[PDB]
Design a protein around this motif. Sequence first.
Motif, short mmCIF file in Angstrom:
data_model
loop_
_atom_site.label_atom_id
_atom_site.label_comp_id
_atom_site.label_asym_id
_atom_site.label_seq_id
_atom_site.Cartn_x
_atom_site.Cartn_y
_atom_site.Cartn_z
N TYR A 41 26.49 31.85 44.21
CA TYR A 41 26.58 33.26 43.89
C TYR A 41 26.40 33.43 42.39
CZ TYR A 41 28.78 37.87 43.25
OH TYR A 41 29.05 39.17 42.90
N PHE B 51 37.10 42.64 32.48
CA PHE B 51 36.78 43.45 31.32
C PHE B 51 37.86 44.51 31.10
CE2 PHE B 51 31.96 42.63 32.01
CZ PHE B 51 32.17 41.29 31.73
N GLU C 109 38.06 35.37 31.34
CA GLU C 109 38.27 34.92 32.71
C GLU C 109 37.64 35.84 33.74
OE1 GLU C 109 39.69 32.00 33.42
OE2 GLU C 109 40.24 31.54 31.35
N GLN D 78 37.89 42.08 43.50
CA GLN D 78 36.70 41.76 42.72
C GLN D 78 36.93 41.97 41.23
OE1 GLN D 78 32.80 43.38 44.17
NE2 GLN D 78 33.80 43.26 46.18
N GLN E 150 43.56 39.97 48.96
CA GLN E 150 43.28 38.58 48.66
C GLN E 150 41.84 38.33 48.23
OE1 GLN E 150 45.90 36.48 48.67
NE2 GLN E 150 47.28 38.05 49.47
N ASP E 151 41.05 39.39 48.07
CA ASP E 151 39.67 39.26 47.59
C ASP E 151 39.34 40.38 46.60
OD1 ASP E 151 39.77 41.25 49.47
OD2 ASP E 151 38.23 40.41 50.78
N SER F 28 35.07 41.68 37.13
CA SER F 28 33.90 42.29 36.51
C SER F 28 32.60 41.59 36.88
CB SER F 28 34.07 42.30 34.99
OG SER F 28 35.09 43.19 34.60
N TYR F 29 32.65 40.34 37.32
CA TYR F 29 31.46 39.61 37.75
C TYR F 29 31.25 39.66 39.25
CZ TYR F 29 31.40 37.71 33.02
OH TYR F 29 31.35 37.57 31.66
N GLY F 30 32.09 40.38 39.99
CA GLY F 30 32.02 40.39 41.43
C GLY F 30 32.73 39.24 42.12
N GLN F 31 33.39 38.36 41.37
CA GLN F 31 34.15 37.28 41.99
C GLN F 31 35.41 37.84 42.64
OE1 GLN F 31 33.42 33.53 39.18
NE2 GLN F 31 34.58 35.13 38.12
N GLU F 32 35.76 37.28 43.80
CA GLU F 32 36.92 37.73 44.56
C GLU F 32 38.10 36.82 44.28
OE1 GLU F 32 34.37 37.27 47.88
OE2 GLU F 32 34.63 39.34 48.53
N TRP F 33 39.25 37.42 44.01
CA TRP F 33 40.46 36.72 43.60
C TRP F 33 41.55 36.89 44.64
CZ3 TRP F 33 41.81 35.07 38.22
CH2 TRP F 33 40.68 35.00 37.40
N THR F 34 42.29 35.82 44.91
CA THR F 34 43.51 35.94 45.70
C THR F 34 44.66 36.43 44.82
OG1 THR F 34 44.41 33.71 45.37
CG2 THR F 34 42.67 33.98 47.01
N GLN G 143 45.90 33.59 42.54
CA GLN G 143 45.04 33.39 41.39
C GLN G 143 45.23 34.49 40.35
OE1 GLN G 143 41.51 33.29 43.69
NE2 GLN G 143 41.56 31.08 44.05
N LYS H 23 27.56 39.97 40.34
CA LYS H 23 27.11 41.27 40.82
C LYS H 23 26.01 41.87 39.96
CE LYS H 23 30.09 44.81 39.68
NZ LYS H 23 30.50 45.29 38.34
N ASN I 96 35.94 33.70 49.70
CA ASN I 96 35.81 34.44 48.46
C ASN I 96 34.65 33.88 47.63
OD1 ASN I 96 37.85 36.24 48.94
ND2 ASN I 96 39.35 35.27 47.60
N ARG I 97 33.88 34.77 47.02
CA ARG I 97 32.72 34.34 46.25
C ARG I 97 33.10 34.07 44.80
NH1 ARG I 97 29.76 40.19 47.06
NH2 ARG I 97 30.89 41.33 45.43
#
Lengths: 268, 983
Positions: free
Chosen positions: A209, B838, B835, B858, B855-856, B860-866, B869, A212, A162-163
């Motif tokens: 990273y 948005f 966090e 995304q 489990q990934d 608002s920033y493109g971060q992937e969350w489980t 989390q 986006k 995950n990024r």
Amino acid sequence: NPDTGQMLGRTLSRWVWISLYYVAFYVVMSGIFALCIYVLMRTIDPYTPDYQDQLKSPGVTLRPDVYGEKGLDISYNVSDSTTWAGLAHTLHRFLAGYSPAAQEGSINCTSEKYFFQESFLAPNHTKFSCKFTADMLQNCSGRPDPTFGFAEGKPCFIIKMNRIVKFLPGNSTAPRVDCAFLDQPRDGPPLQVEYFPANGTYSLHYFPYYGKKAQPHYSNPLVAAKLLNVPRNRDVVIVCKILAEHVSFDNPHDPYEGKVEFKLKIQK
Amino acid sequence: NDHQLSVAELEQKYQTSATKGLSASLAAELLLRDGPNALRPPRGTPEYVKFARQLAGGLQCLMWVAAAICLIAFAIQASEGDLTTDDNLYLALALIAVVVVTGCFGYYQEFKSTNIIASFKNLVPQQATVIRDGDKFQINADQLVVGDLVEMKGGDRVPADIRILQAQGCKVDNSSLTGESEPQTRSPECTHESPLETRNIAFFSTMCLEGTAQGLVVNTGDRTIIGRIASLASGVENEKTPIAIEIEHFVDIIAGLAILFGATFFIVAMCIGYTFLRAMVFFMAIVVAYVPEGLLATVTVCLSLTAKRLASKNCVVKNLEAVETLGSTSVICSDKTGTLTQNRMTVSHLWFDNHIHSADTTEDQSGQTFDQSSETWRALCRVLTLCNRAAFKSGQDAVPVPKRIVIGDASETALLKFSELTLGNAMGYRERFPKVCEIPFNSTNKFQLSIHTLEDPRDPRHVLVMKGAPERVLERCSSILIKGQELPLDEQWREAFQTAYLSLGGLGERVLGFCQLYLSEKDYPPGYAFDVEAMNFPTSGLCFAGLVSMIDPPRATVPDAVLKCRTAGIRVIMVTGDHPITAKAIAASVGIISEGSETVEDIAARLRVPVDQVNRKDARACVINGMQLKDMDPSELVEALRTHPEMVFARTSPQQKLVIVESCQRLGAIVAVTGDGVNDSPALKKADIGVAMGIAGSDAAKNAADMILLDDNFASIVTGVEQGRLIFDNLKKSIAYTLTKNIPELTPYLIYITVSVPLPLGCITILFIELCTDIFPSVSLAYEKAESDIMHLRPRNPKRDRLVNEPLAAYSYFQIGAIQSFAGFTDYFTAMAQEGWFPLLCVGLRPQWENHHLQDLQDSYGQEWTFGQRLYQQYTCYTVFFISIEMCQIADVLIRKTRRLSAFQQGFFRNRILVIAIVFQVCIGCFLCYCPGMPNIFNFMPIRFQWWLVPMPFSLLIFVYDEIRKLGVRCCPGSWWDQELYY
Ligand SMILES: CCCCCCCC/C=C/CCCCCCCC(=O)OC[C@H](COP(=O)(O)OCC[N+](C)(C)C)OC(=O)CCCCCCC/C=C/CCCCCCCC
Ligand SMILES: CCCCCCCC/C=C\CCCCCCCC(=O)OC[C@H](COP(=O)(O)OCC[N+](C)(C)C)OC(=O)CCCCCCC/C=C/CCCCCCCC
Ligand SMILES: CCCCCCCC/C=C\CCCCCCCC(=O)OC[C@H](COP(=O)(O)OCC[N+](C)(C)C)OC(=O)CCCCCCC/C=C\CCCCCCCC
Ligand SMILES: CCCCCCCC/C=C\CCCCCCCC(=O)O[C@H](COC(=O)CCCCCCC/C=C/CCCCCCCC)COP(=O)(O)OCC[N+](C)(C)C
Ligand SMILES: CC(C)CCC[C@@H](C)[C@H]1CC[C@H]2[C@@H]3CC=C4C[C@@H](O)CC[C@]4(C)[C@H]3CC[C@]12C
Ligand SMILES: CC(C)CCC[C@@H](C)[C@H]1CC[C@H]2[C@@H]3CC=C4C[C@@H](O)CC[C@]4(C)[C@H]3CC[C@]12C
Ligand SMILES: CNCC1=CC=C(OCC2=C(OCc3ccccc3)C=CCC2)CC1
Ligand SMILES: *[C@@H]1O[C@H](CO)[C@@H](O)[C@H](O)[C@H]1NC(C)=O
Ligand SMILES: *[C@@H]1O[C@H](CO)[C@@H](O)[C@H](O)[C@H]1NC(C)=O
Ligand SMILES: *[C@@H]1O[C@H](CO)[C@@H](O)[C@H](O)[C@H]1NC(C)=O
Ligand SMILES: [Mg+2]
């Protein structure tokens, strides 16, 4: 209580005034709420989140992803192609986003260390992202084998980390995927994996990273784990963890943090 | 009946004899047809039944229904493979546990009150005396049978209902069964028509004070007058308390709002695309959400605090709901004998020196004393001290004189106590004057006489003191002592004496004449042979000393208590079984009849017109006796009650007391009854609140009453009225505070269902808000002082002034609760966006957010969350919404201290309990947020400090808005703002 002159203990004129009062009250409160949200969104940073409190170590996902009762569970039949046709189709769909046509927005990277960009030099006020194409996965890339080893009982599993914005796995060595049995079948050997790219590493120029907005074309680096000695007609549990200095896989309340665990069965 | 029956018509009905008595075999066989001469014990509720009754009530039933709905929704969800089904179980368990613990608390309050009340309950077996087949043997009273011939003597309880056959100086104490304060003479001659007022019937429960009597048992066991009163009281049903009615109305409001919101959002869910089963589950969730979990406990604790405050004044309630009825009371129907009065004859007035003096009749001697500086007073004191055979019990110095015990007549007891209070050492003074001759109070002479010797050893005269009836001493007494002189009768002193005697008799008092005669030594030398049967001493030509009158006087605090109750707008009605003249005099004394208010008889006597010729509306006071009450129908009784503000009911039977209470209640009033005797037990049971005297009260009265005055202090009534009004106001404030936070608990769920944002507030944190953090601040509002002179306001209108009404509900729910919801959502979106989530992304995010297979996901920033989390982020949202509600509730508890006054006027810190509760709330909030292990135990997260600051402007907005609203209410009474924005 409902009466023409007095409607539920209140005349029609008084109902108008009390309803107008409540309308004004709620309009003012909604305006205050909207102003608060506007102020919040104007103090929010477009590129970097204010806090990453829930993102300390990245999660790890697996392709193809099939979930049974308690988690990931992959079971198919070598003698029956319809059992792994869907799995190979999922892998093909996933790698569709990793063709050179999908990667035309990223650049070639040969650095093998952190891509630390402090300015915006890619077009449209953007930071550069590196290419990951589905040819770096060699055999498990889908060519010349469109079955990803599933037909011959040696399936390929793509492991993706995950990024997280500005997260750094550790630059002493590239983060590396290690797959093994959870509890090894005592009648057999340890799991024999062979990885793509070689050593099962994610190159360090895919980090950090930047989000986006800064990197709209960013693609997570992939590692394909081809399992070569999975026993047939038997349930095995495979754990694939990320070996990096700043990646942890010991959280007991999140089994996907730093590792991925799936059940596997290959029948014949 | 048996009183209106000759011995010839008796002696055959019961197959007995007037002298031989019932045969020993007929009595034994009659004890089989009729049971033992004893009253049937009451029904008797088992303890598990008492606890089950505690487990009931309007709020309790609402909570039971809510728990049942929770379990039904759990079953429906489990028939669909739902995951978040533990919330239903947690809610049902919390509701059931609150109901059970509150029921245990109430049952313990009842049990403790019963223990304290029964502590003063005295127990002892009782004997009798029966003459069967000639043998006069002693038997237990319960072996008595109808037709038995029994003997009674002074100091013995009357063994049953008895028609008196022969009596010699027999007097009976009927003050508990009737209202008669004076001892009643018992003679075998049928005097009155009814058995309750005749002289030849003695009653089962009563005391034979003096003399001896013999008679026939005419009723036994439960057929006696007291047994029939017990039967009448058993058939009286105990109606609901006003506070219970208020709670039921509030439960109806809650149910209506819950159904409305549930149906509206069920329709919304159906129109949004939800399945019918899901929409029904949503409806059930909303309906359950509208039920407050901690409100039952808060109300119970506030009522118990008021009960403790009342018990601090020796006023014990048998149930927690009785602490508000006095505050809601508009009519007090009071008993006279033993309740308003001391049930003890004492010296009240003296007529000597041609002037009527007034004595101190209070039991603690807290009143004024008449002028004792005279010589006629000294002569009168000597006469009344020497002409007395009563004596105090040996070993009495701690007890005050009014409450000492003396052996003798009631009148002799009153005279002895008066002498001990005025002269002091009455027994020593009397023994210092040796007595050489005496004549008891025989019926023929109607006076008591005694010859003594003076204390000084140089005066050889003999003093003859005589006490008796006024118009039996006046036939003697050629002379009268005025200002020490011995002026003779010129018919002017006779006119003055007659006027004084008539006035004292019209004051409802028993008057006694006193006189002295100094026998000459020349005619009567020392050692004279004084013979009672020879009349060798002068029995005429005496010197009148003065008149002494006795009454059963009011208790010390009764007049002030009555005045305070009438100032509070409560109508006070005297209802007594005593005689009308005494009843009217006592009513004037205690303030039930005001000064200058007259009856129609008074106006007729003043205008020299007949009684039928006076306008009834001109008379403020009215005295209705029992025979008139028998003839009047409900319409005339209602007309009399509404015509005469100051009403006195005399010669009233227990059934008629019940009738008067029922009429007052039917007119729409909340009625309090104060009594001590068995004759007001049905009225005490029928009253909205029954109050019985702890010491003077009978067991039947104390069982019927809801309130017991342990010290027999009537001012506890005014204390209870003030406490009831205060608890009504403070319960209003506490309920408003509790209801405010329900909307910020429910709106996140509504947004979760309709807008599909990740769940902003969880079931566990809602339970923590309901049962841990706000109970103490809500309870602390019970210590708020009155915002005005609560004792000068009128009683509330029960049909118009509800505990919870539309302005309170609307304000608390949809203005302050709306602000709290907005604060919670502002904090929620701030914590989400900081966090990485948005608000626009949050909208519609719930399926992906809750998907265990994603489990990934995304942000608002493109971060992937489980999923884990995202769940921890959800717990963070729980915590920020919780803290927003907490801060806004601090502001809410500050604004609920007053309904009209400013916080700057009532005082921010004068409620130390409230300040401590606020600190306690903040401390528990901090502990829940920042204790290790909380995220995985109770899903509370260690939130950042700015999450605390976000709701603070909203809390300040709550405070400022309430301050402005109350300022507008104060500055413009009767305006639109006051009518709509005041609760
Ligand atoms: C108001 C005056 C008292 C009158 C009522 C007395 C009784 C009040 C108690 C009510 C609670 C009902 C009884 C308990 C019901 C739940 C039992 C339970 O199993 O619960 C467990 C949960 C947490 O479970 P977990 O996540 O660890 O389990 C993990 C397991 N898995 C994985 C399945 C989730 O716990 C929870 O729900 C916590 C729920 C929050 C409520 C707890 C009780 C707090 C009450 C405080 C009152 C103190 C006195 C008042 C203040 C003093 C001044 C006057
Ligand atoms: C009975 C009375 C009920 C009243 C209900 C509330 C009425 C008001 C509700 C919505 C009105 C809009 C409020 C939000 C708009 C704020 C002003 C604004 O222009 O903001 C801009 C944002 C878009 O900015 P961006 O993220 O693209 O910029 C990113 C910037 N960079 C890139 C720099 C990071 O626009 C937005 O967020 C729009 C967000 C719209 C959806 C918000 C979530 C909906 C949830 C509502 C729950 C509220 C419950 C209230 C409880 C009341 C109980 C009585
Ligand atoms: C108003 C004041 C009330 C005071 C109440 C009476 C005093 C009792 C209070 C505290 C005594 C115990 C203190 C805690 C024990 C030592 C600390 C410890 O051992 O820490 C070990 C760490 C804590 O983890 P962490 O802090 O990094 O957070 C976890 C972060 N997350 C998201 C990543 C997983 O490993 C763990 O998680 C394991 C921790 C396991 C839980 C520790 C035991 C305490 C929890 C519950 C006991 C009862 C509390 C509720 C009482 C009834 C309701 C009021
Ligand atoms: C009325 C009288 C009150 C007397 C005091 C009450 C008890 C206070 C005692 C201790 C509280 C401080 C110690 C715990 C916090 C530090 C632990 C920590 O570490 O918190 C850290 C944050 O802390 C801070 O930002 C600053 C620390 C203070 C925060 C606010 C403290 C609350 C104070 C409230 C007072 C409000 C008064 C005004 C309102 C009422 C007016 C009447 C949590 O870490 P994180 O979120 O970065 O981790 C995120 C990573 N994840 C989620 C995986 C764990
Ligand atoms: C939010 C929308 C859908 C609600 C529907 C609009 C109508 C029906 C709403 C808007 C304003 C509301 C009124 C606002 C004020 C009051 C005063 C309160 O003492 C009783 C309810 C009452 C009289 C409300 C009745 C319902 C109401 C008239
Ligand atoms: C129009 C916009 C600003 C929103 C509505 C404002 C509301 C709250 C205001 C504007 C006009 C106001 C009304 C004007 C007329 C009356 C009748 C009067 O006897 C009492 C005040 C009362 C009842 C007011 C109540 C509050 C009111 C309805
Ligand atoms: C007095 N306020 C207490 C409450 C306020 C708000 C509530 O929302 C309902 C809710 C949930 O419903 C679950 C539920 C479903 C069906 C029936 C009963 C309960 C679940 C999670 C959060 C919130 C529940 C209780
Ligand atoms: C599927 O595997 C089973 C053994 O589990 C095997 O018998 C069968 O032949 C396989 N599928 C088919 C229908 O070929
Ligand atoms: C990136 O580098 C590789 C190896 O040098 C090259 O073959 C490829 O063409 C480059 N990227 C493009 C343009 O696809
Ligand atoms: C990968 O493919 C090459 C041929 O291109 C082959 O030599 C090698 O053995 C394969 N490795 C595995 C384990 O699939
Ligand atoms: Mg009485």
